[PDB]
Write a protein that binds this ligand. Structure first.
Ligand code: R4M
Ligand code: R4M
Lengths: 11, 214, 214, 11
């Protein structure tokens, strides 16, 4: 869930 | 404690220098990537648990983007300026079936921002208040988000009364634009959900993910 | 100019000393009559053209009544107190299919009003701000309503900082409850419209008239 | 339109 969002917030 | 308007203003300056609906949607997907960067530039936002950052953004993205292009459209005649450089004129939005909501954006937001000459610092502080919404469901520590919101409007008021001493009701005037923003934000989502249901209007991956569940 | 909190407070004190949904609706119809009297007691409200008074009330009745019973329910455990003297417990609203919205009222409104100890004067001033909504469509003179709203939150802030000097962020905290109020207000209408569509749930004449067009 | 409301606001 919320794949894209998490990846962007992590980097 | 610690929430200078300088950092906020910087976050604002760092992120921003045929069917109208389709264009608006594409521009929304594009801005969502930039929104994440904007947020990371907001003090203490990244120090929150990942899940909470995800919760706040998924809860405020629509109002956050509306506030942005609305302020960017202040100099525009009767329409808005998209982040893609495209212009959506009032008549064009009307001819697409979105005249009502579009007009609300111009009248309740763009027009008022222009009348009071809302500056970027004020815009940034208001978006920060929206980002830090303690009412977001699922938050691991709502009290914490509440504190951040408080520190933000505390710095905002200080900023006002100092930059615009002659206008003692300015701070309150900026905050009283949020009720309209919340409403307009809710209405835009409805439209978006209907567009997704009908299938027409291409919706990119990022915008589509925001239209997920919950 | 001229908008004392004393008059507002007075207006508040002067108007207020089986299926849960049905009860809430009946209580809403009952309060609508009282709302008109409350408004007339708000300074300068009656000096506005009749059509405009009608416009403002039809635009804010739902948020105005929510703000009222929410503040009245501060001492209530897990539920709200209706103007009819009836109590709606959280579990009861949940067992009726309205748990989600009901919980939002408790969490975003009733709970927060209780945490900050919002007083009647503050409640009255906020309802006055809602009443005087310059964004209401059709207003013959929106600028005028705007001025009244400004005079209200100017007296409100003065009231605060004086009664609660120790809490410099109080004024902003009260205003930041409006975004939630606007949202909750919009959601309650949707439910009401659905209830009217299904036919179930008796809706009295006054409440029914508010559910008219526009 | 708005029958009830007007009557109450007038009195
Ligand atoms: C939530 C949202 C955001 C758009 C964001 C943009 C376009 C930002 C930007 O380009 O800067 C959607 C809107 C916002 C603008 C209004 C006119 C609209 C109407 C129909 C469908 C969608 C929309
Ligand atoms: C707009 C509205 C007003 C009610 C006002 C009351 C009941 C005031 C009072 O009794 O003091 C409706 C509500 C407000 C309360 C919520 C829980 C609700 C849920 C389903 C249907 C309607 C409602």
């Amino acid at each position: 869930k919320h794949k894209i969002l998490h990846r962007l917030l992590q980097d | 404690e610690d929430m200078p308007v300088e950092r906020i203003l910087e976050a604002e300056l760092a992120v921003e220098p045929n069917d109208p609906v389709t264009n608006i949607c594409q521009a929304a997907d594009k801005q969502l990537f930039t929104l994440v960067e904007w947020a990371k530039r907001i003090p203490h936002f990244s120090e929150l648990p990942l899940d909470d950052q995800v919760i706040l953004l998924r809860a405020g993205w629509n109002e956050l983007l509306i506030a942005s292009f609305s302020h960017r459209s202040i100099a525009v005649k009767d329409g808005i300026l998209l982040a893609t450089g495209l212009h959506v004129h009032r008549n064009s939005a009307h001819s697409a079936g979105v005249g009502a909501i579009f007009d609300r954006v111009l009248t309740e937001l763009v027009s008022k921002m222009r009348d009071m000459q809302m500056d970027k610092t004020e815009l940034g502080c208001l978006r920060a208040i929206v980002l830090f919404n303690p009412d977001s469901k699922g938050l691991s520590n709502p009290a914490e988000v509440e504190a951040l919101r408080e520190k933000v409007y505390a710095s905002l008021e200080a900023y006002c009364k100092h930059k615009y001493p002659e206008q003692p009701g300015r701070f309150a005037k900026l905050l009283l634009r949020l009720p309209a923003l919340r409403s307009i934000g809710l209405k835009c989502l409805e439209h978006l959900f209907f567009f997704k249901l009908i299938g027409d209007t291409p919706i990119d991956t990022f915008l589509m993910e925001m239209l997920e569940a919950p």
